[model samples]
Target chain A: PWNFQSKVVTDTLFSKVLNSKRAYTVFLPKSFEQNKEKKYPVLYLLHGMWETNPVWAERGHVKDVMDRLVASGEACEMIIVTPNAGGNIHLEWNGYFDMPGWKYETFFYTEFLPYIEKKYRVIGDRQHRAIAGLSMGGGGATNYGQRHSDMFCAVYAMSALMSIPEQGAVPADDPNSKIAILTRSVIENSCVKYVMEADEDRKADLRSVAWFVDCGDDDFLLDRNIEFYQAMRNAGVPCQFRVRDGGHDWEYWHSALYQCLPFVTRIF
Target chain B: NFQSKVVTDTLFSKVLNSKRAYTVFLPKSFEQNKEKKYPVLYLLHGMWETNPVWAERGHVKDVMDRLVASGEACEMIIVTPNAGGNIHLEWNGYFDMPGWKYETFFYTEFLPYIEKKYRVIGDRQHRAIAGLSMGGGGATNYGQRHSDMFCAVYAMSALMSIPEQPADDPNSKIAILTRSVIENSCVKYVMEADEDRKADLRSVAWFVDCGDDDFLLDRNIEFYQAMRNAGVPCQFRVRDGGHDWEYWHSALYQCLPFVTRIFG
Candidate 1:
């Protein structure tokens, strides 16, 4: 059925930081045959909490979407990686960080990045890299993009779990529930303070990287997103804030993908 | 080693009075090496096919990728331009008819637009054209008439014979679309041409491929014989498959190496 399909290679590498094997699915554009001296830019696309590495490819149909998008000239050809960032999420609820059992964030910087660069023909530079994600993954994208500002040229986050929105916490929000505990971990473990507590140098560092934060108009995280957007602008940071129509669902995230690709790969 | 990127550029064609699309397969070498320019292959799809089919359905991207990587074919740029069909009553054939001047539009506008936009070498030695079925006729017509602009031309299972009956046959869709019955036979066209035109035909390298099981096999053979009769040099081959992408896919393996050698 896919005569026009590009390649997607799924594999794993052992990370010494986490001391475990991590899986990743990398989307090679139609042009990604072995090149003598040509390397492609990379987009490290992270997934949400409770989602595995294959969620983007299997559920989102990213390969087909990117295939069509690249064919029509909407987006440039680049390697898209959906890696297992949230391994054993039920236990080590701390997301994308050097938390107790899983130091995935350390694994990301110390091992994952080095592994992908050596395995693929990537243009390893600040200008040729980007980070983007949705929901919990959105939070990770912002944290990593802001903390390691020199690594990527563009950072796009959709429906981010950045801060505790007032009158927020959907589905269940009991006093000692998973939502409340998860909320506490957001500030302590996920380091919401670190993601939000931006200084002058931090703002200037972000000024070098293009920032796009898109939240659905009807999303529960709208207030927190707008608050961050306003804070960034008030601090004189160059960023694009979009409140597109739709709830926090696959449809909204799908729409966000359409927006993120053109913005991020503009350098390529 | 080769990593090729396929990009589609949709532009307004003043010649056809309609919007048209063209696809370009650029080698990654084009991206990494700024000072280096590459040869171009203007490939065409069969009748009623659009611009992207050559790369999409024919699997030209993967084919070229493998060939260039394995040192089978050299690094080259490939282009597939859409034939006419955006307007009402417009035939999707590549040629100059009474009212439609697709050939003229191609030379005047399309060629110049692509050359100016991309980093092609822009010379006869660096340019070539190839196609399958009706597009095969186009490659032949364009290559023969514009010999000064190309070094080689490849035609696979081309529709070389136009309808001989239905005089002024608008009812005959093939005649009205592919040609006006007057410009009927490809063999006749080459055989009756002047010595100067035949000399120009001989100047460009020609490769004709047709499947023995293909329905158009007879017409292909006739065309090849006529070219030879006119003292035009052409390499003719009859393969095992029929008139489908399987043949076209295999044809490209032979075509790319042959034409790039002409480019070299």
Candidate 2:
């Protein structure tokens, strides 16, 4: 009987790098309207490849799970934001990154974050913000949370594509296809490479952000997740990693959110 | 770039005195081709599911995108609304209850709001309604009762015939409500209609389908027979499938063309 609400917003943009608008869905707590002065923590939940922002709310039942957890005192009340990170550009699977002119990473930090904080009654501080995603978005969460540790307090990546094949693994790229060029750039500047090759000072900065990595044992990306975990451990970066008995599917991700939200509230 | 986009939104309903959640599927050219008005289709979900079922499970957007892109179906707008208010029954026959007046809210509030907001043709000839299961029943009831509001009616595996009520519990509240709804439903309307009313029924294009193994097949057949006896022009098909999303999803592919043909 929880009374939270969810809505989708379209035609929003603040970046001139790409002449386009992005859509996003937001879930408001039941108390959002009643407590005008109260500021709540925010969780930016990203969707996987080939899915829109509403997919998280529609398919994942995120509002239902969040409402139940908060009602039962299992998790704290917070605002959950799900953005259409790259659905409009026909790159729904693109790990959040900066292309020559797309500048998704730049738009996220400079525009999306500022817009949400200014529009909603959010705390607007690093300690009150969190990021989590699945598949391509999981990689986005890991990379963004690690690279900008000062902006996010916690990161939860589920079934993330932690590693890509070697650049030369694929035949010479066709000069006509931007996908091959983008794929090559992704492999070269991936989060896994950053974590594995970090110095002591960089490792300390990475350890500053609390990390939660999870993947199903039967997931195709399980080895990559394990590699990321081992690399983090070697770098003295503390993170919680779990290998569950399931495949890389929505059923597992839905259950993961139930557990992930509770842990996120604890860190907050 | 993909052509269709699904927008999830909440609109305040004056009849229900509450905000109702809904999803709108805008065609790829909806924004860019602003001057061109398109026909609108209102699709309802079955019992125990919300509006998102069509987009998430049925992949209505993808289907519409492909069909429209290939010129198999006309470009149109589709809207799915949460018919199961905040109640436990899940299957509210677009009817009024003690606490919820969904049917009133939809016709009086939702229909007008969307028609005005989007670049729709906004006429009986350009509007259509369809649904599955409980929603199928909704489409039948609304389309038949408000015949002048829609040009085409599509219902799949609908609860066409109401179950026999207990004669001894005539005074019970549940029995009274059930009987009242049945009397107002399309089943009663068609069964008790005369020649002139049957002519009115034939004015709108109709397509009714049900799976061969569906539990509601008998009910659907009964309604189809009643329509035939009433001399109503309708197309009824019993496909080789069962009562599930897979069956309904395929039925949608068949229905889109049927409705689009009317628009053409």
Candidate 3:
């Protein structure tokens, strides 16, 4: 009685034209076709470094996970997309860590996402949309979610590497200060800081974007993850944090996929 | 410039039929080096993601394209398979409940399927698979389980290992430890296997990298140590970084040479 339908397509993004080929995976819920007229909430699942969209579908069984959830009536019908956002890696570019070729951020926000939204039958508004990822992808999701609260009503992160404290503080002379400035700009535009830190009644009127995070105790970035959790908690940003028995292994993530099933459906 | 298409089968006759597709990356030099057989690298992505994630989000193909364009690396075939789905936690369909049986789909089904479908090098020496995060474990589990299938295996921030402590103890504050041996734990499989059994799949070059600040450091260390104890030769590097792509991107560059050297 349970049927999960999904499609995989590759569209070459001519970096020469805009900057890279951002292929994507679209997982249509079981009831998607039947309810074509009905717009569903969307989940944008991002992959981390050395990984792509198919990695989760192939190795992680993301479709199957969603299939099980839908079959069990734990989640509502929704559209999910896994987009590839790795820009020029062999070329020199800086990442969040100031590493070269970290230009994936620009590719993801500017290029890949808009393409996916247009190509797929996704709900265009922010409330019906969400974003999440694991590790590097986790950081990406959180950064995007916090900075684009107007664009996403929900955000999920599994074992996010929140702060690279060892990389030394953000140097004043860092050329990427502009990026930091842009980040601040987005935070101001999204107005999530007040939502995350201040009480809803006392703080500025912000969109209702829920935040979700899960990490294993043995996860390598436990401390930093906890710190992020604390930051969110301190800011009064309503969030769900699950710290359970597991390491940073795929097994834990495999379990995490299921754990968040009910919650994701609830949000949608 | 191989094309990718998604196919759905009624394997379980359920709503989810192992959804998968293959992305073949042909070296620009493929036509020029027609007579010359190139090695194949199966790049796997992490958990909760799809095959295209690496090529799209990580821009892996772009990296490869540049590397090949410059002659910094040999032109090779790259096949990205979609393996992330529901039945992932199952160890060959054992641990996961009736619904999850991805192990069969991957090792028994998907591997052969892609090999037959694409212009891949069938020989193990020319075949390698590496992944970050979840795919890291996938590379290890599949590579270790089927040594004849691959000659080089690279796992970045690989999060697989057997627990060093007893699970029955109540005082244990460990958050994520093994309650039982599952197919996901490569360390357990090696430790429990007999000599001949281990020998059946022990020839692949192993490369494992994890950031010193990575949450998976302990597991990575233990898994690497277990490989050493099992007499499996492997190279271990604890680089400076976290579990993010900053570490994995670098790791991928390092791992490519290892695979190429093994193939050479």
Model 1: CAPRI class: incorrect
Model 1 clash pairs are none
- C-alpha DockQ for predicted model 3: 0.02
Work out how many backbone clashes candidate 3 has.
59
User: What digit string (tens of lDDT, one per residue) describes model 1 on residues B72-127?
Assistant: 78888898988844323446677776656677878898888887677788999999
Q: Which candidate is the best by lDDT?
A: 2
Which residue segments of model 1 deviate by more than 4 Å? A1-268, B84-90, B163-175, B181-184
Q: Looking at every candidate separately, what fraction of the true A–B Cα contacts under 8 Å does it contain?
A: 0.00, 0.00, 0.00
For each candidate, the DockQ is: 0.01, 0.02, 0.02
Worst 10 residues of 3 chain A by lDDT: A90-99
lDDT by residue (A1-268, candidate 3, tens digit) is 3653644443456443334455667776666666667666778776664465675666456666675566557766677777664433332222322123345555666666676666556677876788777766677677677656678777788877454423332343444554344233322432223334555543222226777889877677677677777766676557788887655555455556766556666766
**Interface root-mean-square deviation, each candidate:** 17.7, 14.3, 17.6
Which of candidates 1 and 3 is the stronger one according to TM-score? 1
TM-score for candidate 3, please give it.
0.43
Give the DockQ of candidate 2: 0.02
Q: lDDT scores for all predictions? A: 0.77, 0.78, 0.62
If the candidates were sorted by their TM-score against the true structure, best first, what order would they fall in?
2, 1, 3
